[PDB]
């Protein structure tokens, strides 16, 4: 990783982590945590999962209860993180938050509308397959220019790897970004603990880790996807935990809001 690897203190290391955990239950006064994102018809998962977690950490660590960090700013402005709507790099996203900073979604609201991701929408959202969205130009003022820019930064960023690092980081500091290999069987997930069994490789996908538990003897992670609440289990999926299912334990990205 381009990031330094997380080191836990002796006290953090010996915490006896519970058999289940849910970020929204751990920090009930942090309203961003249960909010599910919609990346729209743009391959910006890397920036949306990052911004969502950054928002959550503003509340779990940074003393700010309800600031939504702008995924739009990240995806348009961190040209070196990757290629905007054509995908990008979670670790570089967190580094940018530390080196450069991000405005809120009040300053720069997400530029792309709700759409239905691999299903028919009860809300009446058009299918994402109908939209042709390029990366927007980076803007350095608010969309409404009478709103003053407030640039938010982290003071440090770091990488996590493996089941214990993930559980322990989540327990102490709250949601963070992870990535995994998407196969076609993931797309129609609705319930259960996901495990890859069929379907072709479709690409890498970055998502926000929020909890863990065990369901009928099967350990899992609880993950917030970015495909709105109509996908999966109210916008979430559970996925197997412990043997890096689809690579999901191979690398997490995090940091600490100032
Ligand atoms: C991650 C990403 O955005 N992935 C895509 C995605 O979720 N999309 C594309 C169109 C809307 C939405 C959808 O499928 O409903 C897609 C390739 C998943 C099948 C992005 O590609 C990226 O940055 N990946 C690298 C992460 C390390
Ligand atoms: Mg001690």
UniProtKB/TrEMBL annotation:
Residues 17-256 form the Peptidase C1A papain C-terminal domain. Keywords: Hydrolase, Metal-binding, Protease, Signal. Disulfide bonds join 30-59, 42-85, 77-138, 78-81, 107-142, 115-128. One of its GO terms (molecular function) is cysteine-type peptidase activity. One of its GO terms (biological process) is post-transcriptional regulation of gene expression. Mg(2+) binds at residue 11. Thiol protease which is required for parasite excystation and invasion of the proximal small intestine of the human host. Belongs to the peptidase C1 family. This is Cathepsin B-like cysteine protease. It comes from Trypanosoma brucei.
């Amino acid at each position: 990783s381009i990031l330094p690897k997380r080191r836990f203190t002796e006290e953090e290391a010996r915490a006896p982590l519970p058999s289940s955990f849910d970020s929204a239950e751990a920090w009930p006064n942090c309203p961003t945590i249960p909010q599910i994102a919609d990346q729209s018809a743009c391959g910006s998962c890397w920036a949306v999962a990052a911004a969502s977690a950054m928002s959550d950490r503003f509340c779990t660590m940074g003393g700010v209860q309800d600031v939504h960090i702008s995924a739009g700013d990240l995806l348009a402005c961190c040209s070196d993180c990757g290629d905007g709507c054509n995908g990008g790099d979670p670790d570089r996203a967190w580094a940018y938050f530390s080196s450069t900073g991000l405005v809120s979604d009040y300053c720069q609201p997400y530029p792309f509308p709700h759409c239905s991701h691999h299903s028919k929408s009860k809300n009446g959202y058009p299918p994402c397959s109908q939209f042709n969205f390029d990366t927007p130009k980076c803007d350095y003022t608010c969309d409404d220019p009478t709103i003053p820019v407030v640039n938010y930064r982290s003071w440090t960023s770091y990488a996590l790897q493996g089941e214990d690092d993930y559980m322990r980081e989540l327990f102490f500091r709250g949601p963070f970004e992870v990535a995994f290999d998407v196969y076609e069987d993931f797309i129609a997930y609705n319930s259960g603990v996901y495990h890859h069994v069929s379907g072709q490789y479709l690409g890498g996908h970055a998502v926000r880790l929020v909890g863990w538990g065990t369901s009928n003897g099967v350990p899992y992670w609880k993950i917030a996807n970015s495909w709105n609440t109509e996908w999966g289990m109210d916008g979430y999926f559970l996925i197997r935990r412990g043997s890096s299912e689809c690579g999901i334990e191979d690398g997490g990205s995090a940091g600490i809001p100032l």
